[PDB]
């Protein structure tokens, strides 16, 4: 599923991401835009052999099991394929664990490089939330 901007904003808000650990909704929408282009089916292979999955590009090195990342952890206790569903529940629930681990949204490289320190409220502007 390729989400609309406002559609995803509303979905994320319903799942409890607005101000989660102090991060306003615009941060999450911006992160999703630059990580996946709002596409739940996005996958990208990393140099170390791990793979990033879904709308928030969650990494199989630490967070999910894809059966092909040796010595890796599954800290969200899910198969990586579940992060590609049109239903964002699994991705949101895992992201809540990630952003809570001490480093906040800096875990997402595109957030750090393209969202952090910008006017992120622009990403939810005009949306009926
Ligand atoms: Cl933080
Ligand atoms: Na893993």
Query: Which residues have a catalytic role annotated?
Result: 35, 52
| Three-class secondary structure of residue 73 per DSSP | coil
Give the C-alpha separation, 99 to 107, whole Å: 7
Given a contact cutoff of 8 angstroms between Cβ atoms, the answer to whether 36 and 55 are in contact is yes
Q: How far away, in angstroms, is 16 Cα from ligand 1 center?
A: 16
Cβ < 5 A residues, ion ligand 2: 60, 65, 69, 72, 74
Helix axis angle for 25-36 and 5-14, nearest 10°, is 130
Which ligand is closest in space to the CA of residue 94? 2
Q: How far is the CA of 115 from the centre of ligand 2 (A)?
A: 27
Domains, the chain, ranges and CATH? 1-129 (1.10.530.10)
3-state secondary structure 28-49: HHHHHHHHHCCECCCEEECCCC
Q: How far is ligand 2, taken at its centre, from the CA of residue 9, in Å?
A: 28
Q: Which of 82, 72, 1, 79 is nearest to 36 (CA)?
A: 1
Neighbours of ion ligand 1 (CB under 5 A): 104
- C-alpha count within 13 angstroms, C-beta hemisphere, residue 3: 27
A 10 A CB-CB count for 5 gives 15
Q: How was this structure determined?
A: X-ray
Task: Tokens for 45, please give them.
Answer: 């292979």
Strands (E), 48-121: 51-53, 58-59
Quote the CA–CA distance of 94 and 96 in Å, as a whole number. 5
């Amino acid at each position: 599923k390729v989400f609309g901007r406002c559609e995803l904003a509303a979905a994320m808000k319903r799942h409890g991401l607005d101000n989660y650990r102090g991060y306003s909704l615009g941060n999450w929408v911006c992160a999703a835009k630059f990580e996946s282009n709002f596409n739940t089916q996005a996958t990208n292979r990393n140099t170390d052999g791990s793979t990033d999955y879904g709308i928030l590009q969650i990494n199989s090195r630490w967070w999910c099991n894809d059966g092909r990342t040796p010595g890796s952890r599954n800290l969200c206790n899910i198969p990586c394929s579940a992060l590609l569903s049109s239903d964002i529940t699994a991705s949101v629930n895992c992201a809540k664990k990630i952003v809570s681990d001490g480093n906040g949204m800096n875990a997402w490289v595109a957030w750090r490089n393209r969202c952090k320190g910008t006017d992120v409220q622009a990403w939810i502007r005009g949306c009926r939330l």
